[PDB]
Amino acid sequence: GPSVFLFPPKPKDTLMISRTPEVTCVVVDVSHEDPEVKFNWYVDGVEVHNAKTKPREEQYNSTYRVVSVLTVCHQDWLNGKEYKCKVSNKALPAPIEKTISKAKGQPREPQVYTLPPSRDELTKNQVSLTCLVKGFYPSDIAVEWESNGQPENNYKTTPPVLDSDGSFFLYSKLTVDKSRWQQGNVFSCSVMHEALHNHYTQKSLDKSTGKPTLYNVSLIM
Amino acid sequence: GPSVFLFPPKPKDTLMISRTPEVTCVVVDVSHEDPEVKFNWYVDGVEVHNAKTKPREEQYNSTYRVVSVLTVCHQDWLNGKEYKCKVSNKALPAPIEKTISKAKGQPREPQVYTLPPSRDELTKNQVSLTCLVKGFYPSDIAVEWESNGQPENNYKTTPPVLDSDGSFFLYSKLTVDKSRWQQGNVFSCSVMHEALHNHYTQKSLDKSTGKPTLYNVSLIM
Amino acid sequence: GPSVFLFPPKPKDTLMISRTPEVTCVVVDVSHEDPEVKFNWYVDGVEVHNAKTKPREEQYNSTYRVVSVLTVCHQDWLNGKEYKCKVSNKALPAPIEKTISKAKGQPREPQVYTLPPSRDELTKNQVSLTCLVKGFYPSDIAVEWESNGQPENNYKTTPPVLDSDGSFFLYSKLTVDKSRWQQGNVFSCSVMHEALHNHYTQKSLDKSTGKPTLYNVSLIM
Ligand SMILES: *[C@@H]1O[C@H](CO)[C@@H](O)[C@H](O)[C@H]1NC(C)=O
Ligand SMILES: *[C@@H]1O[C@H](CO)[C@@H](O)[C@H](O)[C@H]1NC(C)=O
Ligand SMILES: *[C@@H]1O[C@H](CO)[C@@H](O)[C@H](O)[C@H]1NC(C)=O
């Protein structure tokens, strides 16, 4: 009857400290005649019952969106511990189990190059800052933006694209007020990837990124 | 029960006169006992005979795949003509009428900007050239790289991504060797979208464009 | 009789995800008459028996010095959760309970400024890079040196010093060869602090960071 959908945690809440990691073993299409879904967890074999019991959520099509969330510590998740999720349901003929861990494979150091806007874009009242993050592995990666140590929110991030060499790459455009950009403000693009040292790196740009030694040869007629 | 997958025309072919759109209805999962299938084309309810049928190929799973392509006028697709492929077979109780047409989404023109590689990437053996396309609507765009008219092959392109203004945007990275880059080869990225004037535009770069040094001329009065 | 010194994890380990933090429960002046040691740990009163105990060793003073390493996850120490170590020694009148936790107080975001080497440094073969870090709170902070994504080891860091306004400040001197610094090799300062956004900040520092040399040419014909 009911099916099971397993979701690995996002890179954001497992690659950095102040957001806890949590694996999302979800059960779907649980009908009204068997609302009980039992949550059992294994992390590299040892049974753990510290998961939080999210109560059942009804659905429009008379099913159940019941979610099992397992609290994790970051280091062991980085070690690829397998999450055996044991779920037993009355309409389920047997206890259905699913497994997931860290996406294995040789990690690649994500080279981060932050590119300035093109000169022709400076005509428009809004300006775009781009952050190429290329040559990484796996696709688990997050990119944010910040200026003066405070995050920005008018940015978007394109999904990763497979590269020829077996790596991946992605871009992220931060659109800000052009007035804030011409004032010499500094913008820094943050990259959180497992291969990085301390699982974090940063690069920055300013208005005066490409510039000689201030040869301000100005002609007035 | 055989099913039909309908191919919309590629945006590049619809928006380029030299190329041509190919609306195609694809018939799959046809048992070998009854591979006789006929297609009835109705362009706004008009039976048309121009359809061409390619040779059929057997699938690995002991089913058959008989295909029929249809070259079409550019204005007919650009004006949202209703396209119907009526699939008839002895193994289907009812004909399949899948209709395909272009959307009426108010098209907003893009604003192509392309950026030279960052100074950090100049050290690596290969540089990356990005052709950002921003602000367009709808999401049908093909981006092509080339140098001196020869279309470059080794390049990738991110899928269109929604923005905060309701439009779309995308990038495209070209894997060009650093040795070819430093000689100043001129590379041009091509943007093909229906909202453009003539439905085509391009931007070309060189080391001179976006050079790290810039004599700040400030020709003012 | 025997005494107990309790030590917190080093700021680097608790401040970055790459390493592990340990709360140390040292027992000193442990006589050979009753070498019995018992290690208990309360995490907000929650007993945990995951601790690792190193074997005993002999000092100059005819006693052992055993320790109790306790491996914890970073968010728990960063949450201010209380920790306690109980050691039951027969000679002492009662087993001694010692508590430890995060140094509380309103967090202050560190401000990072990089100062290029003085004009007197180019005479010597090894210039000094200074990463001023000031105006933060509390004194748990790690500073590392990175060049093109790789750490440097020829660096030192002053302990935090009380400032005028109650905050702390510390510097860090990275010694590089004058050839590398004069080659335009990029250098940046990494700061691990609990009050920073994503617990990380970086500041670029180069020859181009200095050398403003306003070359202001004008022509008013
Ligand atoms: C350079 O000249 C321009 C044009 O006169 C002026 O606006 C600008 O302030 C000058 N900058 C410097 C650093 O002298
Ligand atoms: C470069 O020239 C432009 C155009 O006049 C001017 O606005 C800008 O301030 C100049 N840059 C510097 C650093 O002076
Ligand atoms: C540079 O010179 C320009 C005119 O050439 C002047 O407007 C500007 O104020 C100067 N900037 C300085 C001296 O910083």
Side-chain angles (χ1 to χ4, degrees):
Chain A
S3 296
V4 170
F5 273 92
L6 175 56
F7 278 69
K10 322 164 191 167
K12 265 187 311 192
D13 78 322
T14 88
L15 269 70
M16 61 66 58
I17 308 158
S18 66
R19 300 243 296 284
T20 192
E22 43 86 21
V23 183
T24 318
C25 194
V26 201
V27 306
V28 314
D29 256 34
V30 186
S31 64
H32 281 44
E33 267 73 25
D34 44 275
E36 161 189 356
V37 164
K38 180 171 176 160
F39 301 143
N40 301 72
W41 275 107
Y42 312 88
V43 181
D44 268 356
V46 175
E47 209 147 348
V48 179
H49 313 93
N50 279 344
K52 200 58 59 188
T53 51
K54 295 201 173 183
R56 59 203 223 212
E57 186 54 55
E58 220 176 22
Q59 296 272 279
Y60 296 136
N61 66 335
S62 195
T63 73
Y64 266 127
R65 194 41 190 191
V66 195
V67 183
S68 189
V69 47
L70 171 68
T71 315
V72 198
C73 173
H74 294 274
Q75 272 276 15
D76 46 82
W77 153 264
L78 257 300
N79 281 343
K81 298 213 167 164
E82 185 189 74
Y83 304 93
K84 203 156 298 205
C85 155
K86 191 173 198 144
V87 157
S88 308
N89 171 262
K90 305 186 179 178
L92 277 182
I96 308 284
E97 269 194 351
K98 276 276 190 163
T99 57
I100 200 54
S101 83
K102 197 66 199 54
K104 270 321 185 195
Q106 293 303 50
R108 209 143 310 150
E109 202 46 24
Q111 289 334 285
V112 190
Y113 314 102
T114 59
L115 327 168
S118 185
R119 319 148 139 173
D120 61 346
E121 202 231 5
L122 312 175
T123 73
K124 182 54 63 189
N125 307 337
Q126 255 66 24
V127 68
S128 290
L129 286 319
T130 59
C131 190
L132 158 73
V133 198
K134 72 152 298 297
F136 58 88
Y137 203 112
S139 274
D140 302 335
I141 178 189
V143 161
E144 288 213 305
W145 285 84
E146 66 190 56
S147 164
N148 296 355
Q150 292 275 24
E152 302 295 302
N153 294 301
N154 194 6
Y155 82 120
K156 283 296 180 183
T157 283
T158 86
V161 187
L162 170 63
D163 203 22
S164 46
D165 72 325
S167 83
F168 283 78
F169 74 100
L170 77 74
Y171 290 79
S172 187
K173 164 184 71 69
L174 166 61
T175 291
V176 278
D177 197 353
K178 181 183 55 201
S179 71
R180 286 178 44 221
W181 161 259
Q182 43 204 120
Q183 279 154 16
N185 287 42
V186 55
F187 293 97
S188 207
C189 154
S190 75
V191 168
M192 298 191 248
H193 185 267
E194 59 145 285
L196 293 160
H197 215 65
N198 327 315
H199 302 65
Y200 201 105
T201 195
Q202 220 156 297
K203 306 274 186 180
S204 34
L205 39 72
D206 210 272
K207 172 155 195 122
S208 304
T209 285
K211 175 88 193 123
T213 62
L214 273 90
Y215 273 68
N216 215 45
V217 42
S218 183
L219 290 96
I220 322 95
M221 295 315 341
Chain B
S3 304
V4 182
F5 258 29
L6 202 40
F7 264 51
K10 284 172 199 157
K12 165 180 192 182
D13 286 38
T14 74
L15 302 166
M16 264 209 104
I17 297 284
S18 297
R19 293 195 172 199
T20 182
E22 297 196 331
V23 156
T24 309
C25 46
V26 168
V27 168
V28 306
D29 295 310
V30 175
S31 61
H32 264 227
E33 310 99 41
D34 289 345
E36 187 179 20
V37 47
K38 207 55 53 212
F39 330 98
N40 188 11
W41 281 98
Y42 279 120
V43 188
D44 282 28
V46 184
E47 150 66 49
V48 202
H49 101 287
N50 39 0
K52 181 255 159 146
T53 292
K54 268 191 171 182
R56 37 186 186 198
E57 315 158 21
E58 190 182 6
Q59 222 190 103
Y60 272 133
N61 60 356
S62 295
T63 77
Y64 225 136
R65 218 299 317 267
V66 199
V67 83
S68 200
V69 284
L70 168 67
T71 319
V72 280
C73 211
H74 289 54
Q75 327 158 326
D76 295 350
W77 174 258
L78 255 297
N79 299 354
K81 276 215 149 36
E82 184 170 68
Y83 281 18
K84 184 195 296 191
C85 185
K86 263 172 187 247
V87 169
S88 188
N89 198 275
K90 309 303 265 279
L92 280 316
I96 276 155
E97 317 190 34
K98 292 258 197 175
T99 42
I100 187 150
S101 310
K102 85 165 287 187
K104 233 27 163 237
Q106 204 278 314
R108 320 220 320 253
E109 82 270 330
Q111 291 82 228
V112 61
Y113 314 101
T114 171
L115 311 181
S118 273
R119 312 201 289 212
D120 321 329
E121 212 179 35
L122 305 175
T123 75
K124 264 230 280 170
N125 248 340
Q126 288 76 30
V127 278
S128 296
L129 263 306
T130 85
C131 180
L132 169 141
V133 175
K134 187 250 291 183
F136 57 90
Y137 197 21
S139 42
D140 63 330
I141 273 180
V143 173
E144 185 48 9
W145 288 90
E146 49 171 18
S147 186
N148 264 321
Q150 159 73 65
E152 295 295 332
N153 188 283
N154 179 22
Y155 83 109
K156 315 293 181 190
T157 295
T158 73
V161 175
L162 309 103
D163 294 80
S164 53
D165 59 1
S167 80
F168 285 64
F169 86 100
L170 65 99
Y171 286 79
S172 180
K173 175 188 100 91
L174 163 71
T175 306
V176 175
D177 276 348
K178 153 188 61 47
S179 47
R180 281 163 59 140
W181 181 209
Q182 299 281 358
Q183 313 184 10
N185 286 39
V186 175
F187 298 100
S188 68
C189 80
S190 314
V191 152
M192 316 211 192
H193 185 268
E194 52 153 274
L196 285 163
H197 210 324
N198 156 256
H199 321 331
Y200 182 91
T201 191
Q202 71 91 22
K203 295 294 164 192
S204 79
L205 304 171
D206 214 338
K207 330 179 309 303
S208 83
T209 68
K211 191 79 176 180
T213 181
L214 168 65
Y215 325 103
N216 185 273
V217 279
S218 284
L219 309 184
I220 63 188
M221 194 30 245
Chain C
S3 300
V4 166
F5 264 71
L6 202 66
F7 301 102
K10 322 216 177 34
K12 37 185 144 187
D13 319 311
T14 171
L15 258 287
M16 345 177 286
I17 216 75
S18 77
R19 316 184 157 146
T20 59
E22 41 280 16
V23 176
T24 313
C25 199
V26 192
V27 286
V28 317
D29 312 327
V30 193
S31 92
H32 298 221
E33 280 93 33
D34 59 319
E36 196 276 312
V37 305
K38 188 178 114 165
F39 286 132
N40 319 298
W41 295 89
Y42 308 90
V43 189
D44 267 347
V46 182
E47 191 55 45
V48 153
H49 300 297
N50 267 240
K52 335 313 171 279
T53 293
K54 229 56 153 199
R56 54 229 62 199
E57 57 156 17
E58 186 43 55
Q59 313 319 147
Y60 287 86
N61 66 332
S62 286
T63 52
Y64 289 164
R65 286 195 190 171
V66 175
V67 281
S68 199
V69 172
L70 170 76
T71 289
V72 299
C73 205
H74 307 173
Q75 204 167 68
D76 329 302
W77 177 267
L78 253 292
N79 273 351
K81 314 196 198 163
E82 319 162 88
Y83 296 96
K84 199 199 296 189
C85 170
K86 182 195 215 147
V87 175
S88 291
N89 187 271
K90 308 307 183 148
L92 291 184
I96 173 169
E97 282 185 4
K98 260 313 175 171
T99 184
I100 200 156
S101 80
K102 147 78 52 189
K104 331 155 307 188
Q106 42 142 342
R108 205 86 48 80
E109 152 184 49
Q111 276 296 99
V112 185
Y113 321 83
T114 38
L115 313 172
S118 175
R119 185 149 317 276
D120 303 343
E121 293 330 283
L122 316 82
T123 66
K124 310 305 162 190
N125 50 25
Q126 263 185 332
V127 300
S128 303
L129 282 316
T130 280
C131 169
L132 206 168
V133 175
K134 80 181 206 95
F136 60 91
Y137 185 84
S139 72
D140 284 20
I141 186 167
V143 164
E144 326 186 327
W145 277 109
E146 291 273 339
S147 169
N148 52 72
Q150 293 323 339
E152 313 308 303
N153 254 353
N154 186 19
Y155 90 105
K156 286 296 187 182
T157 280
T158 85
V161 198
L162 198 32
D163 213 3
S164 66
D165 55 13
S167 86
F168 282 88
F169 83 101
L170 63 102
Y171 295 29
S172 57
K173 174 181 68 74
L174 154 55
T175 305
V176 317
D177 324 312
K178 187 179 51 204
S179 50
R180 303 184 33 187
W181 168 259
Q182 287 294 337
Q183 267 161 48
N185 286 45
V186 78
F187 288 97
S188 274
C189 189
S190 50
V191 169
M192 311 334 297
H193 195 260
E194 88 190 40
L196 267 167
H197 192 275
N198 315 325
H199 303 355
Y200 199 106
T201 197
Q202 207 151 293
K203 283 310 289 292
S204 38
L205 153 72
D206 264 337
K207 274 178 46 107
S208 57
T209 290
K211 199 218 292 190
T213 179
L214 270 78
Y215 253 71
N216 203 356
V217 182
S218 202
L219 285 97
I220 294 169
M221 313 77 49

